[PDB]
Structure 1
Amino acid sequence: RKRRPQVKLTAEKLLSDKGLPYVLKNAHKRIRISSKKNSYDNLSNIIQFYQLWAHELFPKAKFKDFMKICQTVGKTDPVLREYRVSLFRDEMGM
């Protein structure tokens, strides 16, 4: 009957288990900065982790595109706001 609805980023995907919680678990281990490298290699070490994780969550879209989409969703969704403030409230509590 219909055309298939478009797959699109939303908190029900972006908040889900391999998702922001996967970043909070793995990134502090996998992303390493030093003045012993040039700035361009440090930037590449940051960007690798997020590029592979963005490919795992939403393989449809390029990395710059995924960033523009995350900006619009974090600006609009109240549940995503509630999750982010909840993370900061934990660090303030400690």
Structure 2
Amino acid sequence: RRPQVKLTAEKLLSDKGLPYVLKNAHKRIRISSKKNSYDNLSNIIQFYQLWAHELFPKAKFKDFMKICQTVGKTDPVLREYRVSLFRDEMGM
């Protein structure tokens, strides 16, 4: 009767998602030599889990990562953009 919510390229490419990550990802995340490795890993996973929950509350963190892997493998439009970001850096 109702199509299942699914992590499509459209949601990822929306303002919330990859654009949000590129906007503010280095400022919030911070790996410090003084702090232990566990704390830095916790901080990184803390940022990414919050972003995923804001974007895709449906799936847990590990499931979100696996779905992201599959989508990146499949979707061509996602590949287009992923190549594009790298291309801009080569330009820079």
**Identical counterparts, % of pairs:** 100
Deviation string 1:35-71 (CA, Å, 9 cap, x unpaired) is: 1000000001101110000001110110000000000
Question: Which of 67, 82, 86 is the equivalent residue of 1:88?
Answer: 86
Deviation string 1:63-87 (CA, Å, 9 cap, x unpaired) is: 0000000000000111000000000
- 1:9 match: secondary structure: coil
> TM (normalized to structure 1)?
0.96
Question: Which of 40, 43, 46 is the equivalent residue of 1:45?
Answer: 43
**CA–CA distance in 1 between the matches of 2:34 and 2:44?**
15
- 2:14 match: secondary structure: coil
**CA–CA distance in 1 between the matches of 2:76 and 2:2?**
27
Structure 1 gaps, min length 5: none
**CA–CA distance in 2 between the matches of 1:28 and 1:12?**
24
Structure 2 gaps, min length 5: none
> TM (normalized to structure 2)?
0.98
Moved beyond 3 Å, runs of 4+: none
- 1:65 match: secondary structure: helix
**CA–CA distance in 2 between the matches of 1:49 and 1:22?**
12
Structure 1 partner of 2:20: 22
Structure 1 partner of 2:53: 55
